[PDB]
Structure formats: structure tokens, C-alpha cells
Amino acid sequence: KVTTVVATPGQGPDRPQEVSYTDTKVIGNGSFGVVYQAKLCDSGELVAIKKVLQDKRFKNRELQIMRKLDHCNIVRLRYFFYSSEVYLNLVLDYVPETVYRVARHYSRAKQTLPVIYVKLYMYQLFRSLAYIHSFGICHRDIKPQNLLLDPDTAVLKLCDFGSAKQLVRGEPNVSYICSRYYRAPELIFGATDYTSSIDVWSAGCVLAELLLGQPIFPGDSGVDQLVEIIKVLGTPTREQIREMNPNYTEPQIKAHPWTKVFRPRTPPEAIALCSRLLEYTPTARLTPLEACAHSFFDELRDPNVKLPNGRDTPALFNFTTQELSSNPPLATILIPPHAR
Numbered sequence: 001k002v003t004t005v006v007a008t009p010g011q012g013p014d015r016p017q018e019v020s021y022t023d024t025k026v027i028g029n030g031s032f033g034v035v036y037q038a039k040l041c042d043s044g045e046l047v048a049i050k051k052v053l054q055d056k057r058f059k060n061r062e063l064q065i066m067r068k069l070d071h072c073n074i075v076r077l078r079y080f081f082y083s084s085e086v087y088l089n090l091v092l093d094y095v096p097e098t099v100y101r102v103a104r105h106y107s108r109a110k111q112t113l114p115v116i117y118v119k120l121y122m123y124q125l126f127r128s129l130a131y132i133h134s135f136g137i138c139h140r141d142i143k144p145q146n147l148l149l150d151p152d153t154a155v156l157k158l159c160d161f162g163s164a165k166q167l168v169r170g171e172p173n174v175s176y177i178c179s180r181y182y183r184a185p186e187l188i189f190g191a192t193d194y195t196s197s198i199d200v201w202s203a204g205c206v207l208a209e210l211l212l213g214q215p216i217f218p219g220d221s222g223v224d225q226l227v228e229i230i231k232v233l234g235t236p237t238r239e240q241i242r243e244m245n246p247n248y249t250e251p252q253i254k255a256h257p258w259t260k261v262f263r264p265r266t267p268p269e270a271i272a273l274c275s276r277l278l279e280y281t282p283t284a285r286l287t288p289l290e291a292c293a294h295s296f297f298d299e300l301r302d303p304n305v306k307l308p309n310g311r312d313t314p315a316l317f318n319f320t321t322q323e324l325s326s327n328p329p330l331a332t333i334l335i336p337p338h339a340r
Ligand SMILES: Cc1ccc([N+](=O)[O-])cc1S(=O)(=O)N(C)/N=C/c1cnc2ccc(Br)cn12
Pocket: 027, 028, 029, 030, 032, 033, 034, 035, 048, 050, 075, 092, 093, 094, 095, 096, 098, 145, 146, 148, 159, 160, 161, 162
């Protein structure tokens, strides 16, 4: 009925606090681990609790990554504790929806997700990426299930840092790492020297999916995932293949134009954004901050903009100087006059 634990706060120094929660039910049981929902006894606040098997031989990478992060578009680690063969327990802010589930309502209702929500959710995603990439943390599992929503406030929160890694040049990494559909072509090509731009490819695949109503590259297998990319982008050149994976040394299909991929209705600026994210050569793709400053998101910088339910937009321009470090002159576009 009532559970009490001695939990350590994610921020601050290691000063554990007795925490009591109740109304414990299982809301998720997957490869991510087991996830519960619960109500904190002092504030009545809803928390999600993520529980994974953790042997003491190594420090948990996800916990080490979570404790650094403090950002409004990322789910906050409130506390952590140990239980039970030993499990790590992350107590996290509860978020009631996901982009996966929302996109699916619209799709099964044969309805388009309104472009205003496409903008809000994707801007907030890119912002969360700029923040973590500024620390060299690549998420490596950007997909609709990991994008949590409050549908009343339109706030998006990136979650699950269980695949996340601080990438450092020279130290190679594994090529098979995202959800197939959202996997960057360099990864398919077996690059071990990849950058944070793999998250930007994944972001693009989410963007396109929200415009199309269905995944743009629904690969039948690990190998068919590339055949599906070839259909749209065309066959990558020798020059492009070298940039994705230099070791891959050595079939034509022509590029299908970007306008004709989407419905006639689709805003050109949305299309232009897809083309600057879903490039073959990783270094050509936009950075998360450049993406946030793309003209597709100009409506979010309009002073008059509101949500369809009547409320104001969430906090979109309260940038810290840490967030702006990668390209500070983008502040003159990212923070409009009315916000300064
Ligand atoms: C949807 C989802 C995405 C990621 C994880 N994960 O990394 O353990 C779990 C789940 S889930 O247990 O299937 N579930 C529906 N999650 C609900 C939930 C609600 N609020 C939060 C907040 C953080 C995490 Br993690 C999960 N949630």
C-alpha cells in the first residue's frame, strides 16, 4: 500500500532522503526494464519509476548521464534508490502521453496531426538534443516512443537514456544501435566512428513520419532498411558512402523528389527541413540548434501564436548560455524581440 525508501536526489550532493510513495501499478514492462507509476506521499505528485537490473561491478551509465541533465524538454530524475540480485530504481517526473500514441490516434482515425503540433513537438525535440549534444551525450534511440507529451500544455520531454553514450573521437562504437526505422544510414553501413548527427537523422525520420502519417523508412529487415532509404534519397554516391563509413570500400536508383514524397498540402518549409536533416553525409545535416532556428518553426516565434485549446505555448525561447554555446549568434533568430 505505502512504500518508503531512502532515495538519493539526482541533483545536489549525495544526501539521501526518506521518500514515501503509493498507488503503485505497472505501466510498462519492456527491454527498457520495468516501469511503474506512483504518487509521492508528501506532494501527491505523480512519478514514473524505472527499474533495471544493476550489478555493482560497474556504475550505471544511464544514472551517471541522468544526474548531469537539467532541462525542461528532458524528463527529470527526481530521486534514485536500490532494491531487492539488485535493481536500480530511477524516480522520474511522470508524463501522460507519447508521440507514438498520439501519432497513432490520428493515423487510425485517418486524420493528419496538425502542423502546429508537428512544430511544437519537433522544436522541443531539437532543443533537447542541442542541450545533451553540448555535453557530447548522444541519445542513440530517438524514436516516437521516447518522446513524452502532456497534451494539455503541448510540452515534450525526451526520455530513456539507457542507450545514451558520451561519444569521443578515437573511441569506436557499435553500429547496430537505434530502432530500425530511425537508424542513420552510416550505422547501417557499419560506421563505428559516428557522431551525434545520428540523433538528427532520427529526428528527421520522426518529423517526416508526423507529416506522412506513417514511418518514411519502414524497413522489413536490417538490410531492407537501406533499400527503403534508397527509394527516397537515391543511391548514395561513392563520395557520400565514404563520409558515412570510410572503411566501406567498393547498383543505381534515382532520387525521388522531396515534394512528391509528402501530401500536396505539406508546407514547403517542412519539406526543406526534412531535406536538411535526412542527408546521407552526416556532417551536412543540420545541427539541433540550426534546426530549431529553421524557418519551419517561425510560427512558434510569432507573438500571437497559441495552442488550439486556447492556452499559451510552452517555454520555447528561455535559452541558457549553455544551450547557445555551440552557435551563440543564433540567439538573434532563436529568441524573438517579444521574449527578451
Ligand atoms: C513509453 C516508454 C518509453 C521509455 C521507457 N523507458 O525508457 O523505461 C518506458 C516506457 S513505458 O514503460 O512503456 N511507459 C508507458 N512509460 C510511461 C512513462 C510515463 N512517464 C514516464 C517518464 C519516464 C519514463 Br522512462 C517512462 N514514463
